[PDB]
Amino acid sequence: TQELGNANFENFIGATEGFSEIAYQFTSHILTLGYAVMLAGLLYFILTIKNVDKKFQMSNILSAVVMVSAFLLLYAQAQNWTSSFTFNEEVGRYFLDPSGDLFNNGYRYLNWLIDVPMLLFQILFVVSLTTSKFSSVRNQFWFSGAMMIITGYIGQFYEVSNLTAFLVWGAISSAFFFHILWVMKKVINEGKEGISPAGQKILSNIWILFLISWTLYPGAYLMPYLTGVDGFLYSEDGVMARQLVYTIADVSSKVIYGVLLGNLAITLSKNK
Ligand SMILES: *C/C=C(C)/C=C/C=C(C)/C=C/C1=C(C)CCCC1(C)C
Ligand SMILES: CCCCCC
Ligand SMILES: CCCCCC
Ligand SMILES: [Kr]
Ligand SMILES: [Kr]
Ligand SMILES: [Kr]
Ligand SMILES: [Kr]
Ligand SMILES: [Kr]
Ligand SMILES: [Kr]
Ligand SMILES: [Kr]
Ligand SMILES: [Kr]
Ligand SMILES: [Kr]
Ligand code: NA
């Protein structure tokens, strides 16, 4: 069996079928566009912090720190892609390069462990809770977020070798995920009490963005197996789709999320 590409799904397909120049180039450009948008996000949150009352600026700060970590780690992920796979002129495809370092989703997973807590935390600086304690929500978010990403990371090891383990850890991870959604809805509901109808409208959009953007991750996790073990997506197409959904998700969950919280902060601040 394959000793080289046993690490993850990307390595496996790279070590066996290889990637068409279209698939490799597409994935390369989408990862580059990924970190490019984080760098543009970083400068947006820096330049706009003066547009919100001091009260809300901790949200804009956390957006900025998320953009820094995202840019740096997704830049690493992009380099990790182009370095891991070299062209073979004989076969006319890209294959896992033994002389390079093997492809590694650890860059993105580490980014998640850092950003998930900050992203969950930062809404508590724009909204006021009603009947819930700030510390309780914070602790619930931080714990469930860490556990979601840790169980998810553990599950990701058994992605190729043991699908039973892959899905069980994935389901454990999904349990913590559903708890986060449940608390976030509660937070957003309490957030709507006490604010103008304009601000309640933005919180509605934040909720839908949050719900969709965050649901793309377990989608991308499962992406290789959504058509079976011999399916359309058990190929370079599964790798394409996954890295594309991860990028869409990362841009929506971090950058768009942050822009809507800043907009919320602005309609709250200086608007009477
Ligand atoms: C800035 C990056 C963000 C918001 C990352 C979010 C990550 C998740 C919501 C991932 C959760 C997962 C599951 C629900 C099950 C499978 C494993 C994960 C980690 C992909
Ligand atoms: C890594 C710890 C797993 C806990 C499962 C509930
Ligand atoms: C991968 C680009 C993200 C598109 C913004 C909605
Ligand atoms: Kr900032
Ligand atoms: Kr940076
Ligand atoms: Kr950081
Ligand atoms: Kr860099
Ligand atoms: Kr899920
Ligand atoms: Kr939570
Ligand atoms: Kr809450
Ligand atoms: Kr690919
Ligand atoms: Kr997106
Ligand atoms: Na290469």
Identify how the structure was determined.
Answer: X-ray
User: What letter represents residue 267's amino acid?
Assistant: T
Q: Is 178 helix (H, G, I), strand (E, B) or coil?
A: helix
Q: What is the separation of C-alpha 113 from the centre of its chain, rounded to a whole number of angstroms? A: 10
* DSSP-assigned letters across all residues of 181-208: HHHHHHHHHHHHTTS-HHHHHHHHHHHH
Domains and their CATH numbers in the chain: 9-268 (1.20.1070.10)
Q: How far is the CA of 120 from the centre of ligand 3 (A)?
A: 21
Residue of the CA atom closest to atom 3 of ligand 2? 151
209 lines ligand 5 (CB under 6 A): no
85, 19 contact by CB (below 8 A):
yes
Name the CA dihedral angle for 74, 175, 229, 106, rounded to a multiple of 10 degrees: 20
Structure tokens at 49: 């912090």
DSSP structural state of residue 53:
-
Residue of the CA atom closest to atom 1 of ligand 8? 174
Q: How far apart are CA 69 and CA 153, in angstroms?
A: 18
Return the closest-CA partner of residue 38 out of 106, 85, 108.
108
User: What letter represents residue 46's amino acid?
Assistant: I
Angle between helices 197-222 and 134-157 (to 10 degrees): 20
Residues with CB under 6 A from ligand 2: 150-151, 154, 172
Q: How far is the CA of 50 from the centre of ligand 1 (A)?
A: 32
CA-atom Rg of the chain in angstroms:
20
Q: How far is the CA of 105 from the centre of ligand 11 (A)?
A: 14
11, 5 contact by CB (below 8 A):
yes
Return the closest-CA partner of residue 256 out of 49, 97, 40.
40
Name the CA dihedral angle for 58, 62, 67, 69, rounded to a multiple of 10 degrees: 140
User: What letter represents residue 248's amino acid?
Assistant: I
